[PDB]
DNA sequence: TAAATATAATATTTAATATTAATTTT
DNA sequence: TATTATAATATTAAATATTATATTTA
DNA sequence: AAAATTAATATTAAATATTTATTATTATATATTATAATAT
DNA sequence: ATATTATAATATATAATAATAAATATTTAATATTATAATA
């Protein structure tokens, strides 16, 4: 419902912030990595925010980039992950580091973050392995298909013949020979 | 709580928006039909936002003019309609298109929109014809007749109100079914 | 959480109302008597607003004065009646004649106000017998 | 969530206030001790407020100082104390007086506050004994 | 939870009935149609039942038939139907006649039910249209396989096979009697 | 959900009871009048019961008559009436005396029932004048 | 509140049942294996029933053995597991291979159960490996492939292969006796 | 002065589990 | 000229236990 | 040093039933491929 | 001796049906009130 604020840092204190917007200063909590990048009190700062909406109390959580807020929304949409758990997470590691650790299924790099046990690593890897894949049927097979089409095979029959056996680590000329020798 | 925001389009990321008013940006989601007429980033825009209050989240839903604003709030007032349903409906086609189709009662225009199936289409038709859209924004013979019509391609509603309009009383089947066949023309 | 509003009249679509304040428009619900008191569209006018909160939405109530707002609060504090019967009551009559009527304990004048029968009229009388002062 | 509020005092009505922050005047109630520090109507006054969110209401409680707001948060964090008990504690006595008497484990200085019995006093002292090792 | 009761009737105050099952009475209502099938005070009765759990109340509903319970449950699963509406509907008309009227999708026979609006009638008919279904021995299996080989569906064959001939009859005559039917 | 309970009195701790029905003994809350109509411990007895259901507890309120259960249902069907309030109502005096009082608008006799103020008594009078409708 | 029922099976329609326990019948939904090991309608039986409570509904899910009931309990204790998923997985297969596949970290065994995705089963592995602390041949596929390439329809050929497999005899002879079925 | 009695005001989550620090033994 | 059952609509919704402490009456 | 135990202690929050694009898979003519004799 | 083309098969683009999985939406019960049709 809220995406970003242009205000003035009326007061900083770990780990929250006060952003005086037209006389109105909002309680905004930020991670330590963001806190390091912030200028002094009274400076306009670029925080892209998301509000956590709970029945008894809300939470304003801003970030210097859209990507941080979006990944925090992904982390809070998770089953057993709360907000300040993920705040500790990107306080410990950056977006590229976390993304590469997920793609490498790394646990040792991220268990240094406090509050993270083995089951924390298990749940974060199992969710983030398939929630996002790219973060911001072969050339030899096609040559074989074209060669068998020129040899008289139908394109469907050539596709079936080249998909009949899983040729690996072999040249285009020899893979046709081993596929043609395969079924026969 | 929110009706209108005299402010500038801080960001444009489909389908969401950030609309800056005095430095305050808001997470605003609008249909694609709105996105066609939305000007460049930073330009002061005209967009009637709508708040939906949940126990877990809130979102803002902008509209260019009052007519689709009222259309959206009345559609969400239905028991079966959620926000993304009406968002897809407005993204697919315009208010005049949907009202002129509903008064024509064709589901085919409704169902080509992605995420819109048949059942949603007769729900829209029935529950809008249920008083919102006047303004722009048996016996053995009759049962035998109905069964014959079902066996001859008639859907039961046109076999039903034809019987209701011209019922047959104490006389043989062949003539009131004949005048009913003249009746449905 | 909100007590008063001071902004320019964005538009006039009764019985709803939009007040454009710092470029931000608020949906407020307004009495007909206040509709007789509103200026032209585009006029900076002060509205003394009260919010009601339910589980799925909220409604504001922009008012041109205080004591009408506190009498709204006192009425809606009753479990038997909600805000919109109060809207019908306040569109029916103003503060002083309502005060003398409840002090005179008459249901008949409350009957003519639309949407109100008899039993809710003595509900208003019984409940507001001993709540407020005469001002 | 407003952590600090700085607007002009639109009107004064005990125990509440209306702070017209560029057109919007919030229903804000502050303790009487802050009311002694409150300037007249129309002055730009800075409050370190905090919103209390309920299922049917939202309440703003402004504070001229950050630490009194922090103590308000500690008091409302207690299982039996809501906003108005902490309001009575803030209005009756001063923060340093509270911390000295908690270090002194006093009870009479607490019970003498109106609306406060022996039960609430012994509560606040014994569930507050564990804290304030940091200061 | 509750699926059926086999207890003794205690008192009759229509529509509210009390069913003393082993010392404890059960607050259950039955439709006036079921009032035309209740026994006397003190007589045992078996009622097919199904409960409804509300935020502040639990309501017990018991019918003479299990199929009536299932139709009631499917009516309650509808978004605009409360128990009072379903009781009004079934107090107006009985079950299979309402089923055929749902096949008919006609509002005339259901408007006459008191307290029922026409808009309610068409919305319930449209959202209740027919998506549901319409309301072994050696010789049995041999006939089923023979009619499967003859092209008849196994469910279609079985209902013609097991209906007319008796139990453990000669396979030829019972296949003959099963194929006696026409559409 | 239970409108009648033919059980055996297992325990007698007024105003609560245990009716051991086939080894199952539920908590049974009865008024002091029903306590006078109550037999001794171990006596089989039929109580005409009512259920109250809220989000954290269920209670049983067993009565000697149908009409007692129905009247208790219609008093708790009111907005501002709790269970113990109506318990004190029929504990103070008899049912038909209550019917005569509300048909005669006798607030005084209803005031002498303990736990009942003048305001609550006249509420009961006005919301029960026409609800009985002479049966 | 409730753990066990000992009554008489008044009615049994899958996947539920009606157990008339002292005059009161309960609609209890039980798995396919349980329905296989239940006795006929009218036979008394004792069932390991688990209490299921929603804010607007309540259910029972009974078992012939307790360990089924506790394993159902920790399955429902997971946020990401509903009752239908647990019922489907226990209806499809037995619990001993379930705990062994949890120890063996097997997924494709769980995936073949209907309604089970790869992510669902792999999550079940992820939390169950920490929850549990103490607690056909080559010729079979060759015959199917040969029949498919010969001209036989793929599923009826596998039906003939699995009707009389060559577990103790050669592939050619089991093909020979598999061609008996369709003649 | 000691409560009585409304009267009004004020207040109102829980299990259940995963981490971590201090301790304990080898 | 009132009078009453029926229906569509449009609201409104559901807390109560526990203290603190006024008058009041001895 | 080095793994196991336990008492605080902060944390987190519970979603099912349906529904519609999104993939499977089953005919049916119809613009193709084909041959044969046939003049030139 | 080359094409050619007058009759013969053919294979699939376009109709259809059948799971299926991501994505949502998630409240009616009681009661005044007011028309309203029919009525001493």
CSV table of C-alpha atoms in Angstrom, one decimal, chain G residues 2-181:
chain,number,residue,atom,x,y,z
G,2,UNK,CA,-11.8,-37.8,21.8
G,3,UNK,CA,-9.4,-40.7,21.0
G,4,UNK,CA,-11.4,-43.9,20.6
G,5,UNK,CA,-14.9,-45.1,19.6
G,6,UNK,CA,-16.3,-48.6,20.1
G,7,UNK,CA,-19.7,-48.9,18.4
G,8,UNK,CA,-21.4,-50.7,15.5
G,9,UNK,CA,-20.9,-49.9,11.9
G,10,UNK,CA,-24.3,-48.6,11.0
G,11,UNK,CA,-23.4,-47.4,7.5
G,12,UNK,CA,-20.2,-47.5,5.4
G,13,UNK,CA,-20.0,-45.3,2.2
G,14,UNK,CA,-16.5,-44.5,1.0
G,15,UNK,CA,-14.4,-42.7,2.1
G,16,UNK,CA,-16.5,-42.3,5.3
G,17,UNK,CA,-18.4,-44.5,7.7
G,18,UNK,CA,-21.2,-44.4,10.2
G,19,UNK,CA,-20.3,-46.0,13.6
G,20,UNK,CA,-23.3,-46.1,15.8
G,21,UNK,CA,-21.6,-45.8,19.2
G,22,UNK,CA,-24.3,-46.3,21.8
G,23,UNK,CA,-27.2,-45.0,19.8
G,24,UNK,CA,-25.2,-42.1,18.2
G,25,UNK,CA,-23.7,-42.5,14.8
G,26,UNK,CA,-20.6,-40.6,13.7
G,27,UNK,CA,-19.5,-39.7,10.2
G,28,UNK,CA,-15.8,-40.7,10.3
G,29,UNK,CA,-13.6,-40.5,7.2
G,30,UNK,CA,-11.1,-43.3,7.0
G,31,UNK,CA,-8.4,-44.2,4.4
G,32,UNK,CA,-8.6,-46.8,1.6
G,33,UNK,CA,-6.5,-49.3,3.5
G,34,UNK,CA,-8.6,-48.9,6.6
G,35,UNK,CA,-11.8,-49.4,4.5
G,36,UNK,CA,-10.1,-52.6,3.2
G,37,UNK,CA,-9.5,-53.9,6.8
G,38,UNK,CA,-12.9,-52.8,8.1
G,39,UNK,CA,-15.5,-55.5,8.7
G,40,UNK,CA,-18.9,-55.5,7.2
G,41,UNK,CA,-21.8,-53.1,8.0
G,42,UNK,CA,-23.2,-54.0,11.4
G,43,UNK,CA,-20.0,-55.5,12.9
G,44,UNK,CA,-18.7,-53.9,16.0
G,45,UNK,CA,-15.2,-52.4,15.9
G,46,UNK,CA,-12.9,-50.1,17.9
G,47,UNK,CA,-11.3,-47.2,16.0
G,48,UNK,CA,-8.4,-44.9,16.8
G,49,UNK,CA,-10.2,-41.6,16.1
G,50,UNK,CA,-8.4,-38.3,16.0
G,51,UNK,CA,-10.2,-35.0,17.0
G,52,UNK,CA,-10.3,-32.5,14.2
G,53,UNK,CA,-11.6,-29.0,15.0
G,54,UNK,CA,-12.0,-25.9,12.7
G,55,UNK,CA,-13.6,-22.6,13.8
G,56,UNK,CA,-16.7,-23.5,11.7
G,57,UNK,CA,-16.5,-27.3,11.3
G,58,UNK,CA,-15.2,-30.4,13.1
G,59,UNK,CA,-14.2,-33.8,11.8
G,60,UNK,CA,-13.0,-37.2,12.8
G,61,UNK,CA,-10.4,-39.4,11.1
G,62,UNK,CA,-10.2,-42.9,12.7
G,63,UNK,CA,-7.6,-45.7,12.5
G,64,UNK,CA,-7.4,-49.4,13.2
G,65,UNK,CA,-3.9,-48.7,14.8
G,66,UNK,CA,-2.7,-46.0,17.1
G,67,UNK,CA,0.6,-45.2,15.4
G,68,UNK,CA,-1.4,-44.2,12.3
G,69,UNK,CA,-3.2,-41.7,14.5
G,70,UNK,CA,0.0,-40.1,16.0
G,71,UNK,CA,1.7,-40.0,12.6
G,72,UNK,CA,-1.4,-38.2,11.3
G,73,UNK,CA,-1.1,-35.9,14.3
G,74,UNK,CA,2.4,-34.8,13.4
G,75,UNK,CA,1.5,-34.5,9.7
G,76,UNK,CA,-1.3,-32.1,10.5
G,77,UNK,CA,1.0,-30.4,12.9
G,78,UNK,CA,2.9,-29.1,9.9
G,79,UNK,CA,1.5,-25.8,8.5
G,80,UNK,CA,1.9,-26.9,4.9
G,81,UNK,CA,-0.1,-30.1,5.3
G,82,UNK,CA,-3.9,-30.3,5.2
G,83,UNK,CA,-6.1,-33.2,6.1
G,84,UNK,CA,-6.7,-34.2,2.5
G,85,UNK,CA,-3.0,-34.6,1.7
G,86,UNK,CA,-2.4,-36.9,4.8
G,87,UNK,CA,-5.6,-38.9,4.0
G,88,UNK,CA,-4.5,-39.3,0.3
G,89,UNK,CA,-0.9,-40.4,1.2
G,90,UNK,CA,-2.0,-42.9,3.8
G,91,UNK,CA,-4.8,-44.2,1.6
G,92,UNK,CA,-2.4,-44.8,-1.2
G,93,UNK,CA,0.3,-46.6,0.7
G,94,UNK,CA,1.3,-48.2,4.0
G,95,UNK,CA,3.2,-46.5,6.8
G,96,UNK,CA,6.2,-48.8,7.1
G,97,UNK,CA,7.5,-48.0,3.6
G,98,UNK,CA,6.7,-44.4,4.4
G,99,UNK,CA,9.0,-44.3,7.4
G,100,UNK,CA,11.7,-46.3,5.5
G,101,UNK,CA,11.5,-43.8,2.5
G,102,UNK,CA,11.8,-41.0,5.1
G,103,UNK,CA,15.0,-42.8,6.3
G,104,UNK,CA,16.0,-43.5,2.6
G,105,UNK,CA,15.1,-40.0,1.4
G,106,UNK,CA,13.0,-41.3,-1.4
G,107,UNK,CA,10.7,-38.9,-3.4
G,108,UNK,CA,9.4,-40.8,-6.5
G,109,UNK,CA,7.7,-43.3,-4.2
G,110,UNK,CA,5.7,-40.5,-2.6
G,111,UNK,CA,5.1,-38.6,-5.9
G,112,UNK,CA,3.1,-41.5,-7.5
G,113,UNK,CA,0.5,-41.0,-4.8
G,114,UNK,CA,-2.3,-38.9,-6.4
G,115,UNK,CA,-2.3,-35.2,-5.5
G,116,UNK,CA,1.4,-35.3,-4.4
G,117,UNK,CA,3.8,-32.9,-6.2
G,118,UNK,CA,7.6,-33.2,-6.1
G,119,UNK,CA,7.8,-30.2,-3.9
G,120,UNK,CA,5.2,-31.5,-1.4
G,121,UNK,CA,7.0,-34.9,-1.0
G,122,UNK,CA,10.4,-33.3,-0.8
G,123,UNK,CA,9.2,-30.9,1.9
G,124,UNK,CA,7.7,-33.9,3.8
G,125,UNK,CA,11.2,-35.4,3.6
G,126,UNK,CA,12.7,-32.1,4.9
G,127,UNK,CA,10.6,-31.9,8.0
G,128,UNK,CA,10.3,-35.6,8.6
G,129,UNK,CA,14.0,-36.3,8.7
G,130,UNK,CA,14.1,-34.1,11.8
G,131,UNK,CA,10.7,-35.2,13.1
G,132,UNK,CA,11.7,-38.9,13.3
G,133,UNK,CA,14.3,-39.4,16.1
G,134,UNK,CA,13.7,-42.9,17.5
G,135,UNK,CA,10.3,-44.4,16.4
G,136,UNK,CA,9.1,-56.4,-11.4
G,137,UNK,CA,12.5,-56.7,-13.2
G,138,UNK,CA,14.4,-55.7,-16.3
G,139,UNK,CA,12.5,-58.3,-18.3
G,140,UNK,CA,9.3,-56.8,-16.9
G,141,UNK,CA,10.0,-53.5,-18.7
G,142,UNK,CA,11.6,-55.3,-21.7
G,143,UNK,CA,8.3,-57.2,-22.4
G,144,UNK,CA,6.4,-54.0,-22.2
G,145,UNK,CA,8.8,-52.2,-24.6
G,146,UNK,CA,8.7,-55.2,-27.0
G,147,UNK,CA,4.9,-55.3,-27.0
G,148,UNK,CA,4.7,-51.5,-27.5
G,149,UNK,CA,7.1,-51.7,-30.5
G,150,UNK,CA,5.2,-54.7,-31.8
G,151,UNK,CA,2.0,-52.8,-32.1
G,152,UNK,CA,0.2,-53.3,-28.7
G,153,UNK,CA,-1.5,-50.4,-26.9
G,154,UNK,CA,0.8,-49.2,-24.1
G,155,UNK,CA,-1.5,-49.7,-21.1
G,156,UNK,CA,-3.3,-53.0,-22.0
G,157,UNK,CA,0.1,-54.4,-22.9
G,158,UNK,CA,1.4,-53.5,-19.4
G,159,UNK,CA,-1.9,-55.0,-18.0
G,160,UNK,CA,-1.1,-58.3,-19.7
G,161,UNK,CA,2.5,-58.1,-18.5
G,162,UNK,CA,1.6,-57.4,-14.9
G,163,UNK,CA,-1.3,-59.9,-14.8
G,164,UNK,CA,1.1,-62.8,-14.9
G,165,UNK,CA,4.7,-61.5,-14.6
G,166,UNK,CA,7.8,-63.4,-15.3
G,167,UNK,CA,9.1,-63.2,-11.8
G,168,UNK,CA,10.2,-66.9,-11.8
G,169,UNK,CA,10.4,-67.5,-15.5
G,170,UNK,CA,11.8,-66.1,-18.8
G,171,UNK,CA,10.6,-63.0,-20.6
G,172,UNK,CA,9.5,-65.0,-23.7
G,173,UNK,CA,7.4,-67.4,-21.7
G,174,UNK,CA,5.7,-64.6,-19.7
G,175,UNK,CA,4.9,-62.9,-23.0
G,176,UNK,CA,3.5,-66.2,-24.1
G,177,UNK,CA,1.2,-66.5,-21.1
G,178,UNK,CA,0.4,-62.8,-21.2
G,179,UNK,CA,-1.0,-63.1,-24.7
G,180,UNK,CA,-3.5,-65.6,-23.2
G,181,UNK,CA,-5.5,-62.7,-21.7
